[PDB]
Design a protein around this ligand. Structure first.
Ligand SMILES: [Zn+2]
Lengths: 327, 638, 204
RNA sequence: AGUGAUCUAGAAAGAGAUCCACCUACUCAUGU
């Protein structure tokens, strides 16, 4: 959506409304897989945390302020943005970065494209005048600018793609013969390149969730034994089993997502929630969240809680059997 | 690829002195041999007096009939200079009673009794007279250098002796090892003759690393040994340049305790002025260090050398007869070469020689002598068939070449129409043998009248009989390339040769407009004298000089009508690709490659360097391949 | 050690090290008991005359200071025993002091010389006798404590005696392989009794 | 010289073919 309609979404009210509603739908799709949609139970750090740190890696487009104006006047004149409705308020003051700030708008792509292709045509005219072949160690810095990208000119299949014509409508009429067309029906990275780069987005998302410390205080990282944080980073679906058993195959990674964010899912700031106890251990849930309960049965099987407790008890006994005469 | 970038651009937006030489002191012995024997090996030491003295010896001991004596040298400079000197020695006019003969440089007349020629020129004389009747003694000198032209003359003269009792033959060598040569000429006698006595160091262990070991040896010699210049040997320009910058820099450093040290190069491309710098004195508190190729093995001297290195490597042509292909490979020298190298320390005093290998490897692991087992034979099989030799495979050769390289050579000459299928000389093969060229050059030339451009093709075959013309110094490649562009022809570097010759013949210049258009004057002169000689053979043999009004496609068709075999398609998913063998090559980084009618090249030279390259290329229409050698462009044989 | 992705190694715009400010670092030392550091920070009224508040929020009955504060976290906030002068515990001390103020088979079974009169409880694993601080002289994965006897410093065990005898044996097998089907029989565990009786014969 | 406008929130049983973007890439002639 945002790499097609790039700047046309600022002056559009129903698209921002449906963005906020739709990202709320996606968060409630995640939360109704856990049968609990409490806002305190689910921080913004459990969704926008990238997929390497264990979170979902959702991209934010709905923590903006929606421009609000007088809806008796807004259907008459071009009202100035006189008020701001809050998009998706969390109780925290997490300023979650939005993808539109990390995408170069179209006018700011096209003026730059005319500039860098004037520079390329001038360097090519000079390299023909210099009789030197224009190696691509000079165009660096302007390697990812312009539509189409300069990085197209030195890809490994330029002689093959020399004869590719009519690719736009060939990729556009895939929707009449493919069941799941790619939503990038318009662009083709073989002929245009990657027209966006969101590897700077996730860095500022991590810096906006409070760095790595404030993310991992939500997680079950501290319960794991890691000598450093840096060492943190299904062959069953291919087996012919059953149509219904693929549900449990989907169930399996949901368990590790819930167990990774389990101290902030099973946390105590709960608006309403009854403190049940786990089966046979001393873990108090704050609501019948199923996959969390299954993961805590999974860790604490064989009365491992008891086999912790007893063990520590009798180990203290050995210490007190080691230190009888001292005390 | 060019088209796609244009599409993306559109889409986006004094007498007593000569007595003193050693050979005088065995002149009696040297009759008694010459007199008693139809063939004789003589072996010296370079400086002993053989090139000069022994031919003079022969001209008092063997005198008047209508006859001459030939001496034969592998080296144009040795022929010229030693004929000048021997004319003075006799007290006779150069070009008269003593004379030369060199390719497109003859200095002899109807008075010449003593005729000091290149091996290649005596071989061409023997194409026109297979008895060499006009000579009563023939002296093949520097036979140790085992050139193609000397080995073919040795073979020939073996046979010619058993047709002419009144021909005597004197094989003269600088390598004491005559046994091989005696045996090959039917146990013929030997007579074995100022070098000072070189010390010879060896490493205790095989080096794996000979450049840096050679650098450290030269700096060691410069610290520790008394006055005397150093001669390194190294294998090519790139290596030699690198070791000249790093021994220049390391010697500046040790100048904080050690004498001044002047490096030089030397290698085959050097401009004349930098060649002349090798001969400079040896500063003043000080020494000098020539860094040469094998050119300094035999082909010159440099007067003050007392110390030789010797990482025992050179850059030698090699030809595989069951891939069909020549290459240019860094390779261990022969024992004969290692000896010559050593004997460059020794000219001016005792000397030392610092061999970056084991004494075992000298004695037991270097081959004795190095050319017939390292050659494409096409020229050689043309010359043998002109010499009437109908059973090539049986030809009495002291080292027979692989019968596959001989067979491949007949098949080339048949596709060049020099021979018929039955291995018999066509009228082309006769006329081609009249020219001192390779068969592909000769064929091109011959047919050029019938492409209406025999002046143009005369000039391009003259150019292609010399070096590269275009100076490009490693500091000023932009200026040199700017120069070169003002003769270049877009996808036709053969036509670039025509343009720079014509500009050299322009009513506007000589020497200093060679240097200011970064041209080798020595090349362009040599190409002008070979154009003059080859036009004289053209007149002599009735081949009409012809031009048109301005016709590059005619130039193209003529060149294809020799070099048909040497064609290379553009790949259409990959690099460039070759008609013979099916090699996978690139166009040589000397020449851009206008990929729009480029789709076939004709190439002059295949160049093996770490990659396969093809060098001096000109566009061809592939339809003009199929019309101008239908028998070589048969799908059928493909 | 690039398991860090591109976007974490990509620093922010101003100035690996910028993250390390739970700890991102060592984390294998189990963390300290930190805790109950506490702080108590701090017209007029018609009822009492004091300033600050009105009659609707006065604290004296109508006649005609230290605060549980400085909070950031939740477990500090609830804290049923937040202020603590030991009142209830000393009360139960006083209650406890009030409550504090108020055959032959043993002799038959000393026929042997004892005249004394779910784990083992006498195990005492050698991390418990490693009660003083060492640089992890035990691992709990392999459950193997290191000593100078059968222990090294990436490492192995001391092959003592029988293990050293098999070191002699497979070096003998390597010697018989590097000296002398038979192409396969060159090694120890291939044909074991062969090389065993060859090493027995070699000691004669 | 700026205040002010803050939805959600979880329990039981049942359901469920997933089908798609986060790492760049090319310069020896040993001779004549
Ligand atoms: Zn009051």
């Amino acid at each position: 959506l945002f790499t097609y309609f790039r700047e046309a979404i600022v002056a559009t009210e129903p698209l921002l409304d449906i963005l906020v509603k739709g990202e709320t739908r996606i968060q409630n799709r995640v939360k109704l897989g856990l049968n609990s949609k409490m806002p305190t139970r689910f921080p913004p750090a459990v969704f926008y945390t990238p997929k390497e740190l264990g979170g979902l890696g959702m991209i934010s487009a709905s923590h903006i302020l929606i421009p609000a104006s007088d809806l008796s006047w807004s259907k008459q004149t071009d009202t100035g943005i006189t008020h701001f409705r809050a998009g998706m308020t969390h109780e925290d003051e997490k300023l979650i970065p939005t993808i539109f700030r990390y995408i170069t708008t179209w006018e700011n792509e096209f003026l730059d494209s005319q500039r860098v292709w004037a520079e390329y045509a001038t360097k090519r005219q000079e390299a023909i005048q210099q009789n030197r072949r224009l190696a691509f160690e000079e165009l660096e810095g302007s390697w990812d600018r312009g539509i189409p990208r300069i990085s197209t000119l030195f890809q490994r299949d330029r002689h093959t793609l020399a004869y590719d014509r009519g690719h736009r409508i060939r990729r556009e009429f895939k929707q009449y013969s493919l069941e799941r067309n790619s939503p990038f029906w318009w662009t083709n990275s073989h002929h245009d390149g990657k027209l966006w780069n969101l590897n700077a987005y996730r860095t500022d998302v991590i810096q906006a969730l409070g760095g790595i410390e404030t993310i991992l205080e939500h997680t079950l990282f501290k319960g794991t034994g890691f000598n450093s944080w840096e060492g943190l980073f299904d062959s069953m679906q291919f087996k012919k089993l059953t149509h219904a058993q693929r549900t449990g195959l989907s169930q399996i990674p949901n368990r590790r997502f819930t167990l990774w964010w389990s101290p902030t899912i099973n946390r105590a700031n709960v608006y309403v929630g009854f403190l049940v106890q786990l089966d046979l251990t001393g873990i108090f849930l704050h609501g019948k969240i199923p996959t969390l309960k299954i993961s805590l049965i999974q860790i604490f099987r064989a009365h491992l809680w008891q086999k912790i407790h007893e063990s520590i008890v009798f180990d203290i006994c050995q210490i007190l059997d080691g230190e009888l005469d001292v005390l | 690829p060019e088209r796609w970038e244009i599409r993306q651009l559109i889409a986006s937006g004094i007498s007593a002195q000569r007595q003193t030489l050693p050979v005088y002191a065995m002149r009696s012995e040297l009759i008694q041999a010459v007199r008693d024997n139809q063939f004789l090996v003589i072996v010296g030491e370079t400086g002993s007096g053989k090139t000069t003295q022994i031919t003079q010896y022969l001209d008092e001991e063997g005198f008047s009939n209508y006859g001459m004596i030939g001496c034969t040298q592998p080296r144009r400079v040795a022929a010229v200079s030693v004929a000048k000197r021997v004319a003075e020695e006799v007290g006779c006019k150069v070009g008269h009673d003593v004379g030369y003969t060199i390719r497109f440089e003859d200095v002899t007349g109807p008075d010449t009794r003593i005729k000091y020629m290149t091996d290649g020129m005596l071989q061409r004389e023997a194409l026109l007279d297979p008895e060499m009747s006009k000579y009563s003694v023939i002296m093949l000198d520097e036979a140790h250098e085992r050139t193609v032209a000397t080995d073919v003359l040795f073979a020939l003269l073996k046979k010619a002796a058993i047709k002419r009792p009144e021909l005597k033959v004197i094989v003269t060598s600088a390598t004491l090892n005559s046994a091989k040569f005696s045996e090959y000429f039917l146990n013929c006698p030997i007579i074995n003759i100022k070098t000072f006595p070189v010390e010879v160091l060896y490493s205790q262990t095989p080096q794996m690393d000979y450049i840096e070991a050679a650098l450290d040896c030269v700096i060691d010699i410069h610290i520790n040994e008394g006055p005397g210049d150093i001669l390194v040997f190294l294998t090519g320009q790139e290596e030699i340049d690198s070791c000249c910058e790093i021994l220049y820099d390391r010697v500046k450093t040790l100048g904080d305790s050690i004498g001044e040290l002047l490096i030089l190069p030397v290698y085959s491309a050097l401009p004349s002025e930098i060649q002349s710098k090798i001969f400079e004195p040896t500063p003043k508190g000080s020494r000098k260090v020539v860094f040469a190729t094998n050119i300094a093995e035999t082909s010159i001297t440099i007067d003050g050398i007392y110390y030789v290195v010797d990482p025992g490597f050179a850059k030698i042509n090699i030809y595989n007869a069951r891939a069909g292909i020549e290459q240019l490979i860094v390779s261990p020298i022969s024992q004969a070469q290692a000896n010559q190298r050593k004997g460059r320390a020794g000219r001016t005093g005792p000397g030392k020689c610092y061999r970056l290998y084991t004494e075992s490897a000298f004695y037991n692991e270097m081959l004795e002598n190095t050319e017939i087992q390292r050659q494409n034979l096409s020229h050689t099989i043309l010359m043998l068939k002109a010499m009437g030799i109908n059973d090539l495979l049986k030809f009495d050769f002291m080292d027979p070449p692989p019968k596959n390289l001989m067979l491949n050579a007949l098949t080339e000459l048949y596709h060049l129409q020099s021979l018929d299928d039955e291995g018999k000389l066509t009228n082309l093969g006769k006329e081609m043998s009249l020219f001192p060229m390779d068969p592909t050059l000769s064929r091109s030339l011959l047919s050029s009248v019938d492409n209406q451009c025999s002046d143009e093709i005369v000039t391009i075959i003259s150019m292609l009989s010399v070096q590269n013309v275009f100076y490009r110094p490693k500091d000023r490649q932009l200026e040199a390339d700017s120069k070169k562009a003002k003769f270049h022809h877009p996808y036709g570097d053969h036509l670039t040769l025509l343009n720079v010759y014509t500009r050299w013949q322009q009513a506007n210049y000589s020497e200093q407009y060679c240097k200011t258009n970064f041209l080798h004057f020595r090349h362009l002169k040599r190409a002008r004298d070979v154009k003059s000689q080859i036009s004289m053979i053209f007149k002599k043999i009735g081949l009409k000089l012809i031009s048109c009004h301005s016709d590059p496609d005619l130039i193209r068709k003529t060149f294809v009508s020799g070099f048909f075999m040497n064609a290379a398609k553009r790949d259409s998913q990959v690099g460039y690709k070759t008609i013979n063998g099916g090699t996978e090559v690139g166009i040589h980084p000397s020449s851009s490659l206008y990929g729009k009618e480029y789709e076939y090249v004709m190439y002059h030279s295949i160049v093996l360097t770490s990659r396969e390259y093809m060098s001096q290329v000109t566009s061809i229409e592939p339809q003009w391949l199929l019309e101008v050698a239908p028998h070589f462009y048969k799908a059928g044989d493909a | 050690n690039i398991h860090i992705p591109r976007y974490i190694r990509n620093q922010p715009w101003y100035y690996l090290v910028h993250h390390r400010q739970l700890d991102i670092d060592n984390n294998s030392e189990p963390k300290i008991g930190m805790g109950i550091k506490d702080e108590f920070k701090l017209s007029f009224c018609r009822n009492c005359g004091e300033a600050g508040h009105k009659e609707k929020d006065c604290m004296e009955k109508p006649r005609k200071v230290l605060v549980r504060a400085t909070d950031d976290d939740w477990d500090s906030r609830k804290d049923r025993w937040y202020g603590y002068s030991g009142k209830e515990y000393n009360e139960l001390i006083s209650k406890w002091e009030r409550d504090k103020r108020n055959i032959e088979l043993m002799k038959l079974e000393l026929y042997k010389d004892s005249v004394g009169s779910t784990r083992l409880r006498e195990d005492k694993a050698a991390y418990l006798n490693d009660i003083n601080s060492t640089e992890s002289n035990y691992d709990p994965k392999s459950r193997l404590y290191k000593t100078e006897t059968l222990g090294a410093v990436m490492f192995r065990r001391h092959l003592t005696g029988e293990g050293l005898k098999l070191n002699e044996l497979n070096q003998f097998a390597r010697s018989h392989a590097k000296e002398m089907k038979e192409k396969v029989q060159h090694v120890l565990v291939a044909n074991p009794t062969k090389y065993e009786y060859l090493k027995k014969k070699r000691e004669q």
